[PDB]
Design a protein around this ligand. Structure first.
Ligand SMILES: [Mg+2]
Ligand SMILES: [Mg+2]
Ligand SMILES: [Mg+2]
Ligand SMILES: [Mg+2]
Ligand SMILES: [Mg+2]
Ligand SMILES: [Mg+2]
Length: 72
RNA sequence: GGUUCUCCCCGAAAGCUAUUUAGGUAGCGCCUCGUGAAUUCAUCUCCGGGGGUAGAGCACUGUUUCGGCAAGGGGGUC
């Protein structure tokens, strides 16, 4: 038991993805984003619930019920 | 437009549906990793099924040529 002898348990520390650092890594160039499109752009991607322009599920279905206040 | 070290295993898609949508995006289809579950799945042989395509045919719906039998029209007589 010395400060240069302690070791973490196996599996506790995983490394972490580093994108854009060469071919050998497997995440070089595009960095896992594919080619072009909105999802490849910095800060790109659509908001939660967006399904294209199709009326989303949470707006296609009717609202129902009321909150009690006595239940609280 | 560009995205910087190495080796090992697996390995796509360019389709459908929707979209002020059409070089974008979403669910599903196809890839990967993990966990469960049954001869679960595939090939062949035998058995049980439903077809209406190829081909053919001309009863039907249409189309077509020749012959026979011929109403019945057209034209004169009146
Ligand atoms: Mg790759
Ligand atoms: Mg590019
Ligand atoms: Mg493209
Ligand atoms: Mg993309
Ligand atoms: Mg392979
Ligand atoms: Mg035929």
């Amino acid at each position: 038991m010395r400060l240069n002898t302690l070791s973490p348990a196996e599996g506790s520390k995983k490394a972490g993805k580093r994108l854009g650092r060469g071919i050998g890594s497997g995440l070089g160039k595009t960095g896992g984003r594919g080619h072009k499109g909105q999802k490849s752009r910095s800060g790109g991607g659509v908001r939660r619930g967006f399904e294209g322009g199709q009326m989303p599920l949470y707006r296609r279905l009717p609202k129902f019920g009321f909150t009690s206040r006595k239940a609280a």
